[PDB]
């Protein structure tokens, strides 16, 4: 049902805060964005920038995706991001996440018309 664009927005956009608040940011967000529903999503990154700024990345530096596809774009500037990764104590259905806040260039795969992000590849 969910569009590729809307899935990206749900998993990766958090324009409501400038940066991760607290060590419990990832537990709260991973749950609230429905990323812990049937299993604990092991790794997920949230971007703390406007949706317009993340979308604009699709007309920035064209770079290879890790899988060798050619529709990835690297942000010209660094962006506030939070990486959420499961800890060793994480056991579904009590998922647990480490929160790491950082300022990194993001790399996204773009598709469609409008040409928008559909996958978070990596950050640098
Ligand atoms: Cl959409
Ligand atoms: Cl805002
Ligand atoms: Cl949902
Ligand atoms: Cl999941
Ligand atoms: Cl991710
Ligand atoms: Cl675990
Ligand atoms: Cl859960
Ligand atoms: Cl269209
Ligand atoms: Cl990903
Ligand atoms: Cs920001
Ligand atoms: Cs914690
Ligand atoms: Cs929710
Ligand atoms: Cs391209």
From Swiss-Prot:
Catalytic activity: an [RNA] containing cytidine + H2O = an [RNA]-3'-cytidine-3'-phosphate + a 5'-hydroxy-ribonucleotide-3'-[RNA]; an [RNA] containing uridine + H2O = an [RNA]-3'-uridine-3'-phosphate + a 5'-hydroxy-ribonucleotide-3'-[RNA]
Keyword DNA damage: no
Record: active site: 12 (proton acceptor), 119 (proton donor)
Enzyme class (EC, first level): lyase
Disulphide-bonded residues: 26-84, 40-95, 58-110, 65-72
BP term (GO), one: defense response to Gram-positive bacterium
Keywords of this entry: Disulfide bond, Endonuclease, Glycation, Glycoprotein, Hydrolase, Lyase, Nuclease, Secreted, Signal
Annotated localization: Secreted
Variant or mutagenesis effect after changing residue 12 to A: Loss of activity
Glycosylated residues, chain numbering: 1, 7, 34, 37, 41
Gene Ontology cellular component annotations, sorted alphabetically: extracellular region
Tissues in which the protein is found: Pancreas.
UniProt EC number: 4.6.1.18
Main location: secreted
Disulfide bond keyword on record: yes
Entry binding sites for substrate: 7, 10, 41-45, 66, 85
Any one GO molecular function term: ribonuclease A activity
Record's function text: Endonuclease that catalyzes the cleavage of RNA on the 3' side of pyrimidine nucleotides. Acts on single-stranded and double-stranded RNA.
Family assignment from sequence similarity: Belongs to the pancreatic ribonuclease family.
Quaternary structure, from the entry: Interacts with and forms tight 1:1 complexes with RNH1. Dimerization of two such complexes may occur. Interaction with RNH1 inhibits this protein. Monomer.
Protein name: Ribonuclease pancreatic
Full-protein positions shown: 27 to 150 of 150
């Amino acid at each position: 049902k969910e569009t590729a664009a809307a899935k990206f927005e749900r998993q990766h956009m958090d324009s409501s805060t400038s940066a991760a608040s607290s060590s419990n940011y990832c537990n709260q967000m991973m749950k609230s964005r429905n990323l812990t529903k049937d299993r604990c999503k092991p790794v997920n990154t949230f971007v703390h920038e406007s949706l317009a700024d993340v979308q604009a990345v699709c007309s920035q530096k064209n770079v290879a995706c890790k899988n060798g596809q050619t529709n990835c774009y690297q942000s010209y500037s660094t962006m506030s991001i939070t990486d959420c990764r499961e800890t060793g104590s994480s056991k579904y259905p009590n998922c647990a996440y480490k929160t790491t806040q950082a300022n990194k260039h993001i790399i996204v795969a773009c598709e469609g018309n409008p040409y928008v992000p559909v996958h978070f590849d990596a950050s640098v």
